[PDB]
């Protein structure tokens, strides 16, 4: 499987502090079921998004259904099934910091996965239950698809 996280979200604010760049903007999105924050950074130029739009974000450790754990290299000449066939915006990054509300005695209750898609940042803040599949220094994908609803 390799589905490290799966949940629907909705856009609620874009670049609150003013659009800094010209092709990237902040998406301060929220969830609908797990109630988790989202600070994804998508390429607004090629994949435009407006407020109120919902999308199915799915952090997956691999793009194959069988889950063969690809090494990581651009090999377009590949006929194997790919989960990207049903997503309009896919990215590839490497989580680099898992901050949480830990203490000296009792375990953390809310984590915060910080993943960098080669420059595009994303903070999946929420409870510490559904973020068990995130470990520092590990490759991950995005696999988001806008919902027509």
């Amino acid at each position: 499987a390799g589905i490290l996280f799966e949940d629907i979200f909705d856009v609620k604010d874009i670049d609150p502090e003013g659009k800094k760049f010209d092709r990237v903007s902040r998406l301060h999105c929220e969830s609908e079921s797990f109630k988790m924050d989202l600070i994804l950074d998508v390429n607004i130029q090629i994949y435009p998004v407006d407020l109120g739009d919902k999308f199915r974000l799915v952090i997956a450790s691999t793009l194959y259904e069988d889950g063969t754990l690809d090494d990581g290299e651009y090999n377009p000449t590949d006929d194997r099934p790919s989960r990207a066939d049903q997503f309009e915006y896919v990215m590839y990054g490497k989580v680099y910091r898992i901050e949480g509300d830990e203490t000296s005695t009792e375990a953390a209750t809310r984590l915060s996965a910080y993943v960098s898609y080669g420059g595009l940042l994303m903070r999946l803040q929420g409870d510490a239950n559904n973020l068990h599949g995130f470990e520092v220094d590990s490759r991950v994908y995005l696999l988001m698809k806008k919902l027509a609803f």
């Binding site: 896919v90 990215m91 680099y96 898609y117 420059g119």
Partner: protein
């Protein structure tokens, strides 16, 4: 300007730039954005230029001081707070402070 967040390159440009690399291992890195079109990012290409597994932290010239104290410390809207791990650029924009 090459290491800003809003830098995207196509396969042709990436493959053209890799030719000017005297230490390329010969493997094309996974693009940062597979669909709807394979687009690399300036930081991702610059990572291959960094040799070995280097780790260092530096601050950009236009880094607002009232940012570390408040939230968004590890995720900076202005793309500052250079962070390199295993010799791969992750955040920040390179300037004289880092190069």
């Amino acid at each position: 300007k090459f290491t800003k967040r809003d830098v995207f390159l196509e396969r042709g440009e990436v493959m053209n730039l890799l030719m000017f690399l005297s230490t390329w291992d010969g493997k094309v890195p996974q693009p940062a954005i597979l669909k709807p079109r394979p687009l690399w990012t300036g930081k991702q290409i610059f990572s291959l230029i960094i040799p070995g597994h280097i780790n260092c932290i530096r601050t950009h010239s236009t880094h607002p001081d009232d940012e570390d104290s408040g939230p968004y410390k590890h995720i900076s809207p202005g793309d500052t707070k250079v962070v390199v791990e295993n010799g791969e650029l992750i955040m920040g924009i390179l300037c004289k402070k880092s190069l």
